[PDB]
Amino acid sequence: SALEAKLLDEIKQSSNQELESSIDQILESIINGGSMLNKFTKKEQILSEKQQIKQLSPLQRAALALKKLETKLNNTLHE
Amino acid sequence: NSALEAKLLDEIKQSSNQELESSIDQILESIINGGGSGGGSMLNKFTKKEQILSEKQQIKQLSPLQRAALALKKLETKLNNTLH
Known about the structure:
Chain A: This is CurH. By secondary structure, chain A is an all-alpha fold.
């Protein structure tokens, strides 16, 4: 009910290669998501973060993605 | 903010796999356990219990990376269902 069987099955059926692609694409989506100064500063920050993510392992990328998704959910839910 | 984001990335990079897995697993647990009694009847509550036990059993057999990917998929799905 909390984890649908369709979701558990997809994960059960995945190789590490497939998981890594899923993790990378979700992370890229959350990283991507004012004034000119704000816009420019944000572009620089996103580019910097993307360079740093390249140095992370698949598990490290997953942990970062999970933190970022939870933060976004908590903000959305005012928690 | 950006400084705290840089800080988090550095902490994650420096962390052991067991450290990251402990966080991921606990978040996953918090998701599985996050619902209600399953309804008014004894059979409702029992059925819910057995479902969660089955999910926990399945998760136990997953690799650390499978568990991480499962958590991310679930939260992505939750966000999709929440954002409007």
